[PDB]
Amino acid sequence: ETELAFLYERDIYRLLAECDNSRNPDLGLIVRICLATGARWSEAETLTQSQVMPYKITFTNTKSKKNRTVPISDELFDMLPKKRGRLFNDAYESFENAVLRAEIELPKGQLTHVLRHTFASHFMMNGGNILVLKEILGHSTIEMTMRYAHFAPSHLESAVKFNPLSNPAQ
Amino acid sequence: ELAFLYERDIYRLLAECDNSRNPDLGLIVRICLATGARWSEAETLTQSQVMPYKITFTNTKSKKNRTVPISDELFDMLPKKRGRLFNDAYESFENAVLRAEIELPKGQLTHVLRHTFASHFMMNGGNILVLKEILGHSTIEMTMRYAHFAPSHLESAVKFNPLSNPAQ
Ligand SMILES: [Mg+2]
Ligand SMILES: [Mg+2]
């Protein structure tokens, strides 16, 4: 399955609706965190109150350079549970269930990465700087982010707009 | 270590060029500073490679071919002749740089104008991927050497994410 599947707006909103009606009250938020930051499933699922701060989230695996801080909206921040320790319980099993109700087809074993793919896909499609994206997802190399480059609306007419000759930066 | 020029240097360079015995020096320079063309790519530019508001550079080692758009004002001031548009402005270039009191590490002269284009392109908010094509970089690695000029804006994640602003 050569394709890195991602959801489109319509899917995205139908998935959320189903997630928000999941018998697991934490799913919605976990999915949202993922869509909003591009975090890996576990990264958002195991989130602790100390990674959350007024308008941003920090992800870390081992102190061994895996410390990323991804900015979120006031809206999302305000939705997060105020309690200490782990904000949510495990919710993966409930996810599979929601995705099915939303009529979402995905390649074998892709349910886990789909949200991250979606985030990156749209980020780039929205004109996001691939260099910023590499940091957000926490890739050790830019080659890893290159998988999302084709989404970037390329417009070479910028050479006239950004060249030193007509528009010197300094 | 790659050297590039700043506005003040650029204005003094153009000035020393608009005084060169070689009438082409100033033109070739403007080309490199607007497209990032290697020196030779612009120096040997032939009339057919030019088209209204875009230039097509070609084969260096690999038979390359890319087309960098340009401004009407740059085009409008190009030789309307045929065949090679200019002569050999390299020695004239060195002359101008020296007269401008511009110091550069060994052999940086051939690419300095292109470095300048890249650096400023990136500084001006240019898309690294676009810059990649513009310079004919086979690998994004080569282009990465300009990444540090890119203004980092992680707040953008708040406006580009599919939860709040799905592209479609
Ligand atoms: Mg099962
Ligand atoms: Mg000589």
PDB file of N, CA and C in Angstrom, chain A residues 8-10 12-13 16 32-33 35-37 69-73 76 118-119 122-132 135-136 142-143 146 149 152 154-160 162-165 167-170, chain B residues 6-8 10-11 14 30 33-34 67-71 74 116-117 120-130 132-134 140-141 144 147 150 153-168:
ATOM      1  N   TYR A   8      -9.842  13.942   4.774  1.00  0.00           N
ATOM      2  CA  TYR A   8     -10.185  15.237   4.217  1.00  0.00           C
ATOM      3  C   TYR A   8     -11.196  15.812   5.194  1.00  0.00           C
ATOM      4  N   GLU A   9     -11.336  17.133   5.177  1.00  0.00           N
ATOM      5  CA  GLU A   9     -12.270  17.861   6.031  1.00  0.00           C
ATOM      6  C   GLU A   9     -13.554  17.109   6.389  1.00  0.00           C
ATOM      7  N   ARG A  10     -14.259  16.600   5.381  1.00  0.00           N
ATOM      8  CA  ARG A  10     -15.505  15.885   5.623  1.00  0.00           C
ATOM      9  C   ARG A  10     -15.280  14.659   6.500  1.00  0.00           C
ATOM     10  N   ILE A  12     -12.652  14.114   8.468  1.00  0.00           N
ATOM     11  CA  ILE A  12     -12.182  14.675   9.713  1.00  0.00           C
ATOM     12  C   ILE A  12     -13.326  15.032  10.642  1.00  0.00           C
ATOM     13  N   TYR A  13     -14.334  15.711  10.131  1.00  0.00           N
ATOM     14  CA  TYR A  13     -15.432  16.096  10.986  1.00  0.00           C
ATOM     15  C   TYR A  13     -16.378  14.963  11.329  1.00  0.00           C
ATOM     16  N   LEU A  16     -14.556  12.941  14.093  1.00  0.00           N
ATOM     17  CA  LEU A  16     -14.676  13.596  15.383  1.00  0.00           C
ATOM     18  C   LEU A  16     -16.049  13.345  15.972  1.00  0.00           C
ATOM     19  N   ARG A  32      -8.139  14.889  18.675  1.00  0.00           N
ATOM     20  CA  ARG A  32      -7.946  16.310  18.461  1.00  0.00           C
ATOM     21  C   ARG A  32      -6.504  16.738  18.639  1.00  0.00           C
ATOM     22  N   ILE A  33      -5.863  16.225  19.682  1.00  0.00           N
ATOM     23  CA  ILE A  33      -4.485  16.596  19.948  1.00  0.00           C
ATOM     24  C   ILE A  33      -3.626  16.177  18.782  1.00  0.00           C
ATOM     25  N   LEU A  35      -4.553  15.557  15.568  1.00  0.00           N
ATOM     26  CA  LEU A  35      -4.893  16.345  14.380  1.00  0.00           C
ATOM     27  C   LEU A  35      -4.322  17.755  14.449  1.00  0.00           C
ATOM     28  N   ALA A  36      -4.285  18.295  15.660  1.00  0.00           N
ATOM     29  CA  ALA A  36      -3.789  19.635  15.890  1.00  0.00           C
ATOM     30  C   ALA A  36      -2.268  19.761  15.988  1.00  0.00           C
ATOM     31  N   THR A  37      -1.570  18.664  16.269  1.00  0.00           N
ATOM     32  CA  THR A  37      -0.121  18.715  16.432  1.00  0.00           C
ATOM     33  C   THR A  37       0.681  17.741  15.587  1.00  0.00           C
ATOM     34  N   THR A  69       8.111  20.899  21.347  1.00  0.00           N
ATOM     35  CA  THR A  69       7.042  21.667  21.951  1.00  0.00           C
ATOM     36  C   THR A  69       6.186  22.170  20.804  1.00  0.00           C
ATOM     37  N   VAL A  70       4.946  21.707  20.741  1.00  0.00           N
ATOM     38  CA  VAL A  70       4.058  22.129  19.676  1.00  0.00           C
ATOM     39  C   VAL A  70       2.907  22.996  20.187  1.00  0.00           C
ATOM     40  N   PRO A  71       2.835  24.250  19.706  1.00  0.00           N
ATOM     41  CA  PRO A  71       1.820  25.253  20.045  1.00  0.00           C
ATOM     42  C   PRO A  71       0.429  24.816  19.621  1.00  0.00           C
ATOM     43  N   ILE A  72      -0.551  25.043  20.492  1.00  0.00           N
ATOM     44  CA  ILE A  72      -1.952  24.704  20.215  1.00  0.00           C
ATOM     45  C   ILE A  72      -2.803  25.958  20.430  1.00  0.00           C
ATOM     46  N   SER A  73      -4.077  25.910  20.065  1.00  0.00           N
ATOM     47  CA  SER A  73      -4.923  27.069  20.248  1.00  0.00           C
ATOM     48  C   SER A  73      -5.407  27.141  21.679  1.00  0.00           C
ATOM     49  N   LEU A  76      -8.216  24.626  22.227  1.00  0.00           N
ATOM     50  CA  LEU A  76      -7.849  23.249  22.555  1.00  0.00           C
ATOM     51  C   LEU A  76      -7.364  23.162  24.004  1.00  0.00           C
ATOM     52  N   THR A 118      -2.542  12.964   8.278  1.00  0.00           N
ATOM     53  CA  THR A 118      -3.486  14.031   8.011  1.00  0.00           C
ATOM     54  C   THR A 118      -2.902  15.377   8.388  1.00  0.00           C
ATOM     55  N   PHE A 119      -2.417  15.501   9.620  1.00  0.00           N
ATOM     56  CA  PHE A 119      -1.830  16.751  10.060  1.00  0.00           C
ATOM     57  C   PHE A 119      -0.783  17.246   9.072  1.00  0.00           C
ATOM     58  N   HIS A 122      -2.127  18.260   5.407  1.00  0.00           N
ATOM     59  CA  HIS A 122      -2.810  19.554   5.397  1.00  0.00           C
ATOM     60  C   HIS A 122      -1.916  20.740   5.707  1.00  0.00           C
ATOM     61  N   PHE A 123      -0.977  20.530   6.620  1.00  0.00           N
ATOM     62  CA  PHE A 123      -0.035  21.560   7.005  1.00  0.00           C
ATOM     63  C   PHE A 123       0.621  22.047   5.727  1.00  0.00           C
ATOM     64  N   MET A 124       1.189  21.099   4.984  1.00  0.00           N
ATOM     65  CA  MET A 124       1.857  21.390   3.719  1.00  0.00           C
ATOM     66  C   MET A 124       0.889  21.953   2.682  1.00  0.00           C
ATOM     67  N   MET A 125      -0.251  21.301   2.522  1.00  0.00           N
ATOM     68  CA  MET A 125      -1.249  21.785   1.589  1.00  0.00           C
ATOM     69  C   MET A 125      -1.618  23.240   1.907  1.00  0.00           C
ATOM     70  N   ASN A 126      -1.656  23.582   3.193  1.00  0.00           N
ATOM     71  CA  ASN A 126      -2.000  24.936   3.623  1.00  0.00           C
ATOM     72  C   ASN A 126      -0.856  25.919   3.411  1.00  0.00           C
ATOM     73  N   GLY A 127       0.234  25.451   2.822  1.00  0.00           N
ATOM     74  CA  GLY A 127       1.348  26.338   2.582  1.00  0.00           C
ATOM     75  C   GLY A 127       2.336  26.400   3.725  1.00  0.00           C
ATOM     76  N   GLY A 128       2.264  25.422   4.627  1.00  0.00           N
ATOM     77  CA  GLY A 128       3.184  25.375   5.749  1.00  0.00           C
ATOM     78  C   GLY A 128       4.616  25.135   5.297  1.00  0.00           C
ATOM     79  N   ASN A 129       5.575  25.747   5.986  1.00  0.00           N
ATOM     80  CA  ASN A 129       6.984  25.592   5.643  1.00  0.00           C
ATOM     81  C   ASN A 129       7.459  24.214   6.071  1.00  0.00           C
ATOM     82  N   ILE A 130       7.938  23.422   5.121  1.00  0.00           N
ATOM     83  CA  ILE A 130       8.366  22.064   5.418  1.00  0.00           C
ATOM     84  C   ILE A 130       9.432  22.008   6.491  1.00  0.00           C
ATOM     85  N   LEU A 131      10.205  23.075   6.632  1.00  0.00           N
ATOM     86  CA  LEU A 131      11.251  23.102   7.655  1.00  0.00           C
ATOM     87  C   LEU A 131      10.624  23.185   9.066  1.00  0.00           C
ATOM     88  N   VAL A 132       9.512  23.904   9.173  1.00  0.00           N
ATOM     89  CA  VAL A 132       8.811  24.038  10.438  1.00  0.00           C
ATOM     90  C   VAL A 132       8.228  22.665  10.762  1.00  0.00           C
ATOM     91  N   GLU A 135      10.395  19.941  12.384  1.00  0.00           N
ATOM     92  CA  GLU A 135      10.540  20.136  13.829  1.00  0.00           C
ATOM     93  C   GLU A 135       9.311  19.658  14.588  1.00  0.00           C
ATOM     94  N   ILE A 136       8.133  20.066  14.121  1.00  0.00           N
ATOM     95  CA  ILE A 136       6.877  19.693  14.762  1.00  0.00           C
ATOM     96  C   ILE A 136       6.711  18.180  14.958  1.00  0.00           C
ATOM     97  N   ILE A 142      15.557  15.796   7.328  1.00  0.00           N
ATOM     98  CA  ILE A 142      14.534  16.412   6.498  1.00  0.00           C
ATOM     99  C   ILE A 142      13.984  15.407   5.484  1.00  0.00           C
ATOM    100  N   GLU A 143      14.771  14.380   5.169  1.00  0.00           N
ATOM    101  CA  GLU A 143      14.330  13.345   4.238  1.00  0.00           C
ATOM    102  C   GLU A 143      13.013  12.730   4.732  1.00  0.00           C
ATOM    103  N   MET A 146      10.230  14.942   3.715  1.00  0.00           N
ATOM    104  CA  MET A 146      10.105  14.947   2.259  1.00  0.00           C
ATOM    105  C   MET A 146       8.929  14.130   1.753  1.00  0.00           C
ATOM    106  N   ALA A 149       6.256  16.668   1.008  1.00  0.00           N
ATOM    107  CA  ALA A 149       6.566  17.764   0.100  1.00  0.00           C
ATOM    108  C   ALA A 149       5.588  17.976  -1.073  1.00  0.00           C
ATOM    109  N   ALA A 152       2.850  20.618  -0.984  1.00  0.00           N
ATOM    110  CA  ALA A 152       3.200  22.029  -0.985  1.00  0.00           C
ATOM    111  C   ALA A 152       2.870  22.716  -2.291  1.00  0.00           C
ATOM    112  N   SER A 154       3.467  24.645  -4.995  1.00  0.00           N
ATOM    113  CA  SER A 154       4.673  25.301  -5.498  1.00  0.00           C
ATOM    114  C   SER A 154       4.357  26.424  -6.485  1.00  0.00           C
ATOM    115  N   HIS A 155       4.956  27.585  -6.243  1.00  0.00           N
ATOM    116  CA  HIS A 155       4.755  28.758  -7.084  1.00  0.00           C
ATOM    117  C   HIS A 155       6.057  29.528  -7.286  1.00  0.00           C
ATOM    118  N   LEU A 156       6.757  29.191  -8.367  1.00  0.00           N
ATOM    119  CA  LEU A 156       8.038  29.806  -8.717  1.00  0.00           C
ATOM    120  C   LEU A 156       8.018  31.312  -8.997  1.00  0.00           C
ATOM    121  N   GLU A 157       6.830  31.896  -9.132  1.00  0.00           N
ATOM    122  CA  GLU A 157       6.734  33.328  -9.388  1.00  0.00           C
ATOM    123  C   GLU A 157       7.318  34.120  -8.208  1.00  0.00           C
ATOM    124  N   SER A 158       7.736  33.402  -7.165  1.00  0.00           N
ATOM    125  CA  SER A 158       8.318  34.015  -5.981  1.00  0.00           C
ATOM    126  C   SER A 158       9.749  34.493  -6.227  1.00  0.00           C
ATOM    127  N   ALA A 159      10.412  33.940  -7.242  1.00  0.00           N
ATOM    128  CA  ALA A 159      11.782  34.344  -7.563  1.00  0.00           C
ATOM    129  C   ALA A 159      11.858  35.843  -7.862  1.00  0.00           C
ATOM    130  N   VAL A 160      10.813  36.377  -8.482  1.00  0.00           N
ATOM    131  CA  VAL A 160      10.766  37.799  -8.810  1.00  0.00           C
ATOM    132  C   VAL A 160      10.483  38.607  -7.537  1.00  0.00           C
ATOM    133  N   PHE A 162      11.086  37.554  -4.204  1.00  0.00           N
ATOM    134  CA  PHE A 162      12.076  37.391  -3.144  1.00  0.00           C
ATOM    135  C   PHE A 162      13.562  37.505  -3.493  1.00  0.00           C
ATOM    136  N   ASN A 163      13.897  37.738  -4.754  1.00  0.00           N
ATOM    137  CA  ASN A 163      15.306  37.836  -5.131  1.00  0.00           C
ATOM    138  C   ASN A 163      15.945  39.107  -4.571  1.00  0.00           C
ATOM    139  N   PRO A 164      17.254  39.049  -4.286  1.00  0.00           N
ATOM    140  CA  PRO A 164      18.011  40.179  -3.749  1.00  0.00           C
ATOM    141  C   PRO A 164      17.867  41.428  -4.615  1.00  0.00           C
ATOM    142  N   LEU A 165      17.996  41.256  -5.932  1.00  0.00           N
ATOM    143  CA  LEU A 165      17.927  42.371  -6.876  1.00  0.00           C
ATOM    144  C   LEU A 165      16.749  43.333  -6.707  1.00  0.00           C
ATOM    145  N   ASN A 167      14.073  42.870  -4.385  1.00  0.00           N
ATOM    146  CA  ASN A 167      13.689  42.919  -2.980  1.00  0.00           C
ATOM    147  C   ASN A 167      14.789  42.399  -2.046  1.00  0.00           C
ATOM    148  N   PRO A 168      15.777  43.251  -1.732  1.00  0.00           N
ATOM    149  CA  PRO A 168      16.890  42.891  -0.846  1.00  0.00           C
ATOM    150  C   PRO A 168      16.404  42.783   0.601  1.00  0.00           C
ATOM    151  N   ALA A 169      16.633  41.623   1.212  1.00  0.00           N
ATOM    152  CA  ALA A 169      16.198  41.353   2.587  1.00  0.00           C
ATOM    153  C   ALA A 169      16.946  42.120   3.672  1.00  0.00           C
ATOM    154  N   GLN A 170      18.224  41.795   3.831  1.00  0.00           N
ATOM    155  CA  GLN A 170      19.085  42.425   4.826  1.00  0.00           C
ATOM    156  C   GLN A 170      18.764  41.994   6.265  1.00  0.00           C
TER     157      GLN A 170
ATOM    158  N   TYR B   6      25.135  41.512   1.088  1.00  0.00           N
ATOM    159  CA  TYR B   6      24.052  42.260   1.726  1.00  0.00           C
ATOM    160  C   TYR B   6      23.740  43.463   0.837  1.00  0.00           C
ATOM    161  N   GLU B   7      22.545  44.009   1.009  1.00  0.00           N
ATOM    162  CA  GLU B   7      22.068  45.167   0.259  1.00  0.00           C
ATOM    163  C   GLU B   7      23.137  46.225  -0.020  1.00  0.00           C
ATOM    164  N   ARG B   8      23.838  46.677   1.016  1.00  0.00           N
ATOM    165  CA  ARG B   8      24.862  47.704   0.843  1.00  0.00           C
ATOM    166  C   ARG B   8      25.941  47.291  -0.149  1.00  0.00           C
ATOM    167  N   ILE B  10      25.602  44.919  -2.492  1.00  0.00           N
ATOM    168  CA  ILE B  10      24.920  44.778  -3.754  1.00  0.00           C
ATOM    169  C   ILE B  10      24.819  46.114  -4.488  1.00  0.00           C
ATOM    170  N   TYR B  11      24.500  47.183  -3.771  1.00  0.00           N
ATOM    171  CA  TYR B  11      24.387  48.484  -4.417  1.00  0.00           C
ATOM    172  C   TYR B  11      25.732  49.004  -4.876  1.00  0.00           C
ATOM    173  N   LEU B  14      26.687  46.770  -8.058  1.00  0.00           N
ATOM    174  CA  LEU B  14      25.994  47.229  -9.249  1.00  0.00           C
ATOM    175  C   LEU B  14      26.623  48.544  -9.748  1.00  0.00           C
ATOM    176  N   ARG B  30      23.109  41.056 -12.683  1.00  0.00           N
ATOM    177  CA  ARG B  30      21.688  41.160 -12.358  1.00  0.00           C
ATOM    178  C   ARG B  30      20.941  39.851 -12.554  1.00  0.00           C
ATOM    179  N   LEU B  33      21.796  37.522  -9.593  1.00  0.00           N
ATOM    180  CA  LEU B  33      21.129  38.045  -8.402  1.00  0.00           C
ATOM    181  C   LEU B  33      19.617  37.961  -8.451  1.00  0.00           C
ATOM    182  N   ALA B  34      19.065  37.493  -9.560  1.00  0.00           N
ATOM    183  CA  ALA B  34      17.614  37.418  -9.660  1.00  0.00           C
ATOM    184  C   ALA B  34      17.099  36.009  -9.883  1.00  0.00           C
ATOM    185  N   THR B  67      13.456  26.468 -15.499  1.00  0.00           N
ATOM    186  CA  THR B  67      13.072  27.796 -15.931  1.00  0.00           C
ATOM    187  C   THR B  67      12.655  28.707 -14.782  1.00  0.00           C
ATOM    188  N   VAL B  68      13.491  29.713 -14.531  1.00  0.00           N
ATOM    189  CA  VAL B  68      13.266  30.682 -13.465  1.00  0.00           C
ATOM    190  C   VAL B  68      12.614  31.943 -14.006  1.00  0.00           C
ATOM    191  N   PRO B  69      11.411  32.270 -13.513  1.00  0.00           N
ATOM    192  CA  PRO B  69      10.715  33.468 -13.974  1.00  0.00           C
ATOM    193  C   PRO B  69      11.488  34.717 -13.569  1.00  0.00           C
ATOM    194  N   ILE B  70      11.291  35.802 -14.316  1.00  0.00           N
ATOM    195  CA  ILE B  70      11.957  37.084 -14.051  1.00  0.00           C
ATOM    196  C   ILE B  70      10.995  38.257 -14.284  1.00  0.00           C
ATOM    197  N   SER B  71      11.405  39.458 -13.888  1.00  0.00           N
ATOM    198  CA  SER B  71      10.567  40.645 -14.052  1.00  0.00           C
ATOM    199  C   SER B  71      10.656  41.265 -15.444  1.00  0.00           C
ATOM    200  N   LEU B  74      13.648  43.325 -16.042  1.00  0.00           N
ATOM    201  CA  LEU B  74      14.912  42.618 -16.196  1.00  0.00           C
ATOM    202  C   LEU B  74      14.986  42.160 -17.647  1.00  0.00           C
ATOM    203  N   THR B 116      24.012  34.675  -2.642  1.00  0.00           N
ATOM    204  CA  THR B 116      23.258  35.863  -2.273  1.00  0.00           C
ATOM    205  C   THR B 116      21.774  35.773  -2.601  1.00  0.00           C
ATOM    206  N   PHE B 117      21.471  35.202  -3.762  1.00  0.00           N
ATOM    207  CA  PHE B 117      20.094  35.040  -4.188  1.00  0.00           C
ATOM    208  C   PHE B 117      19.407  34.106  -3.209  1.00  0.00           C
ATOM    209  N   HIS B 120      19.016  35.481   0.494  1.00  0.00           N
ATOM    210  CA  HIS B 120      17.944  36.461   0.554  1.00  0.00           C
ATOM    211  C   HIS B 120      16.576  35.879   0.239  1.00  0.00           C
ATOM    212  N   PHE B 121      16.533  34.893  -0.650  1.00  0.00           N
ATOM    213  CA  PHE B 121      15.274  34.258  -1.019  1.00  0.00           C
ATOM    214  C   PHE B 121      14.686  33.666   0.257  1.00  0.00           C
ATOM    215  N   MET B 122      15.509  32.882   0.951  1.00  0.00           N
ATOM    216  CA  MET B 122      15.131  32.237   2.202  1.00  0.00           C
ATOM    217  C   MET B 122      14.796  33.242   3.301  1.00  0.00           C
ATOM    218  N   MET B 123      15.623  34.272   3.432  1.00  0.00           N
ATOM    219  CA  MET B 123      15.390  35.308   4.425  1.00  0.00           C
ATOM    220  C   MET B 123      14.073  36.025   4.166  1.00  0.00           C
ATOM    221  N   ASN B 124      13.771  36.277   2.894  1.00  0.00           N
ATOM    222  CA  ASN B 124      12.535  36.960   2.518  1.00  0.00           C
ATOM    223  C   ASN B 124      11.266  36.128   2.694  1.00  0.00           C
ATOM    224  N   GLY B 125      11.417  34.931   3.259  1.00  0.00           N
ATOM    225  CA  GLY B 125      10.278  34.059   3.487  1.00  0.00           C
ATOM    226  C   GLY B 125      10.018  33.073   2.368  1.00  0.00           C
ATOM    227  N   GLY B 126      11.027  32.839   1.530  1.00  0.00           N
ATOM    228  CA  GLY B 126      10.880  31.913   0.419  1.00  0.00           C
ATOM    229  C   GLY B 126      10.788  30.450   0.818  1.00  0.00           C
ATOM    230  N   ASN B 127      10.039  29.674   0.038  1.00  0.00           N
ATOM    231  CA  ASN B 127       9.866  28.250   0.302  1.00  0.00           C
ATOM    232  C   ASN B 127      11.063  27.455  -0.207  1.00  0.00           C
ATOM    233  N   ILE B 128      11.749  26.827   0.739  1.00  0.00           N
ATOM    234  CA  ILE B 128      12.946  26.023   0.508  1.00  0.00           C
ATOM    235  C   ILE B 128      12.794  25.056  -0.670  1.00  0.00           C
ATOM    236  N   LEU B 129      11.600  24.490  -0.795  1.00  0.00           N
ATOM    237  CA  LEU B 129      11.309  23.536  -1.856  1.00  0.00           C
ATOM    238  C   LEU B 129      11.330  24.251  -3.205  1.00  0.00           C
ATOM    239  N   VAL B 130      10.757  25.454  -3.236  1.00  0.00           N
ATOM    240  CA  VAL B 130      10.722  26.262  -4.442  1.00  0.00           C
ATOM    241  C   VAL B 130      12.167  26.601  -4.798  1.00  0.00           C
ATOM    242  N   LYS B 132      14.724  25.050  -4.107  1.00  0.00           N
ATOM    243  CA  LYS B 132      15.396  23.821  -4.543  1.00  0.00           C
ATOM    244  C   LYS B 132      15.330  23.700  -6.059  1.00  0.00           C
ATOM    245  N   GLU B 133      14.124  23.861  -6.595  1.00  0.00           N
ATOM    246  CA  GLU B 133      13.916  23.769  -8.029  1.00  0.00           C
ATOM    247  C   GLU B 133      14.636  24.920  -8.715  1.00  0.00           C
ATOM    248  N   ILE B 134      14.402  26.128  -8.214  1.00  0.00           N
ATOM    249  CA  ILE B 134      14.998  27.336  -8.762  1.00  0.00           C
ATOM    250  C   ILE B 134      16.498  27.255  -8.979  1.00  0.00           C
ATOM    251  N   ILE B 140      17.569  17.804  -1.860  1.00  0.00           N
ATOM    252  CA  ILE B 140      17.213  18.858  -0.916  1.00  0.00           C
ATOM    253  C   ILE B 140      18.368  19.137   0.060  1.00  0.00           C
ATOM    254  N   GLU B 141      19.303  18.197   0.182  1.00  0.00           N
ATOM    255  CA  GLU B 141      20.455  18.366   1.073  1.00  0.00           C
ATOM    256  C   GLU B 141      21.242  19.618   0.715  1.00  0.00           C
ATOM    257  N   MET B 144      19.553  22.584   1.671  1.00  0.00           N
ATOM    258  CA  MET B 144      19.462  22.717   3.122  1.00  0.00           C
ATOM    259  C   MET B 144      20.468  23.702   3.673  1.00  0.00           C
ATOM    260  N   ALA B 147      18.799  26.753   4.714  1.00  0.00           N
ATOM    261  CA  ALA B 147      17.716  26.584   5.673  1.00  0.00           C
ATOM    262  C   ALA B 147      17.796  27.510   6.887  1.00  0.00           C
ATOM    263  N   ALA B 150      15.942  30.781   6.958  1.00  0.00           N
ATOM    264  CA  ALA B 150      14.510  30.692   7.075  1.00  0.00           C
ATOM    265  C   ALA B 150      14.006  31.125   8.435  1.00  0.00           C
ATOM    266  N   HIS B 153       8.736  29.824  12.330  1.00  0.00           N
ATOM    267  CA  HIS B 153       7.455  30.258  12.881  1.00  0.00           C
ATOM    268  C   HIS B 153       6.617  29.041  13.283  1.00  0.00           C
ATOM    269  N   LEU B 154       6.848  28.482  14.473  1.00  0.00           N
ATOM    270  CA  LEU B 154       6.066  27.316  14.919  1.00  0.00           C
ATOM    271  C   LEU B 154       4.621  27.632  15.292  1.00  0.00           C
ATOM    272  N   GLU B 155       4.302  28.914  15.420  1.00  0.00           N
ATOM    273  CA  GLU B 155       2.940  29.339  15.742  1.00  0.00           C
ATOM    274  C   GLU B 155       2.010  29.000  14.569  1.00  0.00           C
ATOM    275  N   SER B 156       2.602  28.876  13.383  1.00  0.00           N
ATOM    276  CA  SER B 156       1.869  28.554  12.165  1.00  0.00           C
ATOM    277  C   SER B 156       1.078  27.255  12.317  1.00  0.00           C
ATOM    278  N   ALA B 157       1.599  26.335  13.124  1.00  0.00           N
ATOM    279  CA  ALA B 157       0.928  25.067  13.375  1.00  0.00           C
ATOM    280  C   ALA B 157      -0.487  25.311  13.856  1.00  0.00           C
ATOM    281  N   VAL B 158      -0.690  26.436  14.520  1.00  0.00           N
ATOM    282  CA  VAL B 158      -2.001  26.759  15.049  1.00  0.00           C
ATOM    283  C   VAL B 158      -2.983  27.172  13.954  1.00  0.00           C
ATOM    284  N   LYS B 159      -2.442  27.637  12.825  1.00  0.00           N
ATOM    285  CA  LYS B 159      -3.274  28.077  11.705  1.00  0.00           C
ATOM    286  C   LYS B 159      -3.308  27.142  10.493  1.00  0.00           C
ATOM    287  N   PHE B 160      -2.377  26.192  10.458  1.00  0.00           N
ATOM    288  CA  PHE B 160      -2.292  25.245   9.354  1.00  0.00           C
ATOM    289  C   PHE B 160      -2.799  23.829   9.640  1.00  0.00           C
ATOM    290  N   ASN B 161      -3.109  23.517  10.898  1.00  0.00           N
ATOM    291  CA  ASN B 161      -3.564  22.165  11.255  1.00  0.00           C
ATOM    292  C   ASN B 161      -4.969  21.797  10.746  1.00  0.00           C
ATOM    293  N   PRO B 162      -5.168  20.528  10.355  1.00  0.00           N
ATOM    294  CA  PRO B 162      -6.445  20.033   9.845  1.00  0.00           C
ATOM    295  C   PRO B 162      -7.617  20.022  10.826  1.00  0.00           C
ATOM    296  N   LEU B 163      -7.359  20.281  12.106  1.00  0.00           N
ATOM    297  CA  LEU B 163      -8.453  20.308  13.076  1.00  0.00           C
ATOM    298  C   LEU B 163      -9.183  21.636  12.939  1.00  0.00           C
ATOM    299  N   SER B 164      -8.427  22.727  12.810  1.00  0.00           N
ATOM    300  CA  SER B 164      -9.030  24.057  12.675  1.00  0.00           C
ATOM    301  C   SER B 164      -9.139  24.576  11.236  1.00  0.00           C
ATOM    302  N   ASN B 165      -8.111  24.351  10.425  1.00  0.00           N
ATOM    303  CA  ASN B 165      -8.149  24.807   9.046  1.00  0.00           C
ATOM    304  C   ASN B 165      -7.809  23.697   8.051  1.00  0.00           C
ATOM    305  N   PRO B 166      -8.741  22.750   7.842  1.00  0.00           N
ATOM    306  CA  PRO B 166      -8.478  21.665   6.895  1.00  0.00           C
ATOM    307  C   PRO B 166      -8.430  22.261   5.481  1.00  0.00           C
ATOM    308  N   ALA B 167      -7.343  21.976   4.772  1.00  0.00           N
ATOM    309  CA  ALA B 167      -7.129  22.472   3.418  1.00  0.00           C
ATOM    310  C   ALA B 167      -8.121  22.025   2.348  1.00  0.00           C
ATOM    311  N   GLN B 168      -8.265  20.708   2.156  1.00  0.00           N
ATOM    312  CA  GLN B 168      -9.124  20.108   1.109  1.00  0.00           C
ATOM    313  C   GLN B 168      -8.494  20.189  -0.298  1.00  0.00           C
TER     314      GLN B 168
END
